[PDB]
Design a binder for this molecule. Structure first.
Ligand SMILES: Nc1ncnc2c1ncn2[C@@H]1O[C@H](COP(=O)(O)OP(=O)(O)O)[C@@H](O)[C@H]1O
Ligand SMILES: Nc1ncnc2c1ncn2[C@@H]1O[C@H](COP(=O)(O)OP(=O)(O)O)[C@@H](O)[C@H]1O
Ligand code: BEF
Ligand code: BEF
Ligand SMILES: [Mg+2]
Ligand SMILES: [Mg+2]
Lengths: 417, 417
């Protein structure tokens, strides 16, 4: 008796099971209400019920166990968590809790937690003694997260160009700067697919705030990982809540020496949401940005770091420029002094239908020698010195024509000499 | 005895009928008052009266049935809908209701609804069980909505250029960016005529907010569809109300697997209206735009989506640029990074009296391979690569001179090779 197991079951089988259990007509009923009635009827027989979810401690002291399939939205099937148990096990926002639950009695509206069985997918004896995320020693990117497929596919050209322009390692904090209508969607899809193919052990999390739902359901059915999104039909409060829950879960996972990867596509939208939810202080800067509005996105971005004791946190955010709004322009670069990695995309190259439209000149990675060998770094330096004199479109055409001849970049580097 | 039937009748016949029924002199009376008196006299004999309209639920709990011929304006002949029936049939704003009505008794001012016969042009048993619009899975444009006439007319050149620049499919969410005095009116008229000619099965709705009455009555007598407009003589409150009613009706139609097409021509004017009706919060951004003013137009624009279960919603809005106001430059923009189709028009080409004055270079459609075949996409790519080096005016002249030689674009593509 698990909550996620009943959530994954279809509607027809749940209706059939409820009709066999002998309850009210479930055809004219919601799936969540059907599951609730089935759990009630199964607990009336004396059997136990189990559930799971991410903890969201409220300001009063209690909390609930949000579900991932609903993008951490407030649902009727949330499991209550009393503050007594929180105080007894030192629980915090983001801790994954899995234990026995019971249906609400007369006068209650949510399931109660009796005994916790597993904390953060581990024993509670290992979670009671742990080092906080704020005390971990940061470090630079040491492990190399190669994005090249290696299967010789035609779509691998984007990953090869990305590796030649800006290699990505564990704990990297980069930025994907690109004007609208440049190809950010396809680039993010390719990055997510390459991460899921090359490094399936890492925890991939794609955050899409204030996006077109069709794109949400497309990304959810395309990438092999977790997708937490919030369409534009929701207020900025839900955006802030989802961002907080995601970053808290990422911190709790990193605290257990896990490799978390967050592919953010709405850093600008997140900053707009934070500027909308912040109370007015009577002081407005140039472009309509509050003085204390960028602090929360600043911390959300700076949360990414590489841990020496174990694990890492990678955050790749895509910033929006040339959107016609001065607020986004002020945000983007305020954040430019940030992202230890900038991958610029050119609109002029995208208009020529030359995919990918990557600005190789302004791209780059700091401390790239820690992720590449000596000969590889020398070859990349020679390639950059050869590409720099040529124009952007000409350099992109040259790179595409030279990478189409071979499958691996090593052969291209060997033929360049 | 139908309301719309009496509304379509002329004034002279209604006056004659009222004089034959033996009532007060109807020559010095309004047509609506004449219809009201005729309905009263016909109901005094014991016969039944029927009406219809779009439901507009008020904040208190009751509602009225607005009429389409009055642009959903508050009229004396609105049918009152009690909240009891709303609670009994789960009615919402936008549901088309058609049932028996009765004249108001002593102390009443509006017609009452006794029994509902048809809901959303369908049986109530099919409307009681339905999936909300917020739960439908979005998708990209799959079905091709070809705009080419095919009759070899001289006006078909605009549709041919539009198809070669940006093909339109079901569920598309585009933008027509053009400075003033460019030819937006003729272009919108041609688009509406091509939609009514090629795809007469789709529900066409043209929304004109804050425009001149002459243009309104011109569009109403030119296109073959529904025209809901609101001239500048009305406050922004009526603009917001009309936009809400139109989008709610569109959502209710899409919920019944219908293909709705909305040709918006005032996205900038709608954003200005929303910025005017929003209460001041003491925080003004660059250009005079409120922080929470663009949220409602953002949702109105993002409502457009393609449904996998059935139906679609297409919204083609025309944004205004270079109007001398910085608010529109932020308002029209901020919207640039939202849609997935931009059809730019050049003022320099319009000054040369070269119609249509379309910027073929900056135009385009994302995921265009889902609406065109392989050979068609290759021919469009070759045409774009040939047109790109030439200047805007030169490319437009070349395209016009090459399309004037033949009737179909297939012959032009075959002759280009
Ligand atoms: N690698 C690519 N190959 C082919 N087309 C692409 C590629 N990247 C982008 N595009 C085209 O650009 C359009 C928009 O790209 P997108 O990633 O949505 O840009 P952004 O996210 O910056 O708005 C897509 O619909 C696609 O047709
Ligand atoms: N396809 C066309 N053919 C001929 N003239 C046009 C065409 N499109 C626009 N025009 C001219 O431009 C004028 C204004 O066009 P309009 O569509 O009103 O531009 P906008 O809507 O951008 O203000 C029209 O009065 C018309 O004379
Ligand atoms: F319009 Be893109 F997604 F920035
Ligand atoms: F003056 Be146009 F209608 F933008
Ligand atoms: Mg995008
Ligand atoms: Mg116009």
């Amino acid at each position: 008796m698990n909550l996620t197991e009943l959530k994954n079951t279809p509607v027809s089988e749940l209706i059939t099971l409820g009709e066999n259990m002998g309850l009210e007509n479930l055809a004219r009923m919601r799936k969540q209400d059907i599951i609730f009635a089935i759990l009630k009827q199964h607990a009336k027989s004396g059997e136990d019920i189990f559930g799971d979810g991410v903890l969201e401690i409220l300001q009063d002291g209690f909390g609930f166990l949000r579900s991932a399939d609903s993008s951490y939205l407030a649902g009727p099937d949330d499991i209550y968590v009393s503050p007594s148990q929180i105080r007894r096990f030192n629980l915090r926002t983001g801790d994954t809790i899995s234990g026995k639950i019971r249906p609400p009695k007369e006068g209650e509206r949510y399931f109660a937690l009796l005994k916790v069985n597993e904390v953060n997918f581990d024993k509670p004896e290992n979670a009671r003694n742990k080092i906080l995320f704020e005390n971990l020693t940061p470090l630079h990117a040491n492990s190399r997260l190669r994005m090249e497929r290696g299967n010789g596919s035609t779509e691998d050209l984007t990953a090869r160009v990305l590796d030649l322009a800006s290699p990505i390692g564990r704990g990297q904090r980069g930025l994907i700067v690109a004007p609208p209508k440049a190809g950010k969607t396809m680039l993010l899809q390719n990055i997510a697919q390459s991460i899921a193919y090359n490094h399936p052990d890492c925890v991939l999390m794609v955050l899409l705030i204030d996006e077109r739902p069709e794109e949400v359901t497309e990304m959810q059915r395309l990438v092999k990982g977790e997708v937490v999104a919030s369409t534009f039909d929701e207020p900025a409060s839900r955006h802030v809540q989802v961002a907080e829950m995601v970053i808290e879960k990422a911190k709790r996972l990193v605290e257990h020496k896990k490799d978390v990867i967050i592919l953010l596509d709405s850093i600008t939208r997140l900053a707009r949401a934070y500027n909308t939810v912040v109370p007015a202080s009577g002081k407005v800067l140039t472009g309509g940005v509050d003085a204390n509005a960028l602090h929360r996105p600043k911390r959300f971005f700076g949360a990414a770091r590489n841990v020496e004791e174990g694990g890492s946190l990678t955050i790749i955010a895509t910033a929006l420029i040339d959107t016609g709004s001065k607020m986004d322009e002020v945000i983007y670069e305020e954040f430019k002094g940030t992202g230890n990695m900038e991958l610029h995309l050119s609109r002029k190259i995208a208009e020529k239908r030359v995919f990918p439209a990557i600005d190789y000149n302004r791209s780059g990675t700091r401390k790239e020698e820690l992720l590449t060998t000596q000969e590889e770094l020398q070859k990349m330096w020679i390639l950059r010195k050869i590409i720099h004199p040529m124009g952007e479109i000409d350099a992109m055409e040259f790179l595409i024509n030279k990478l189409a001849m071979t499958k691996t970049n090593d052969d291209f580097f060997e033929m360049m000499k």
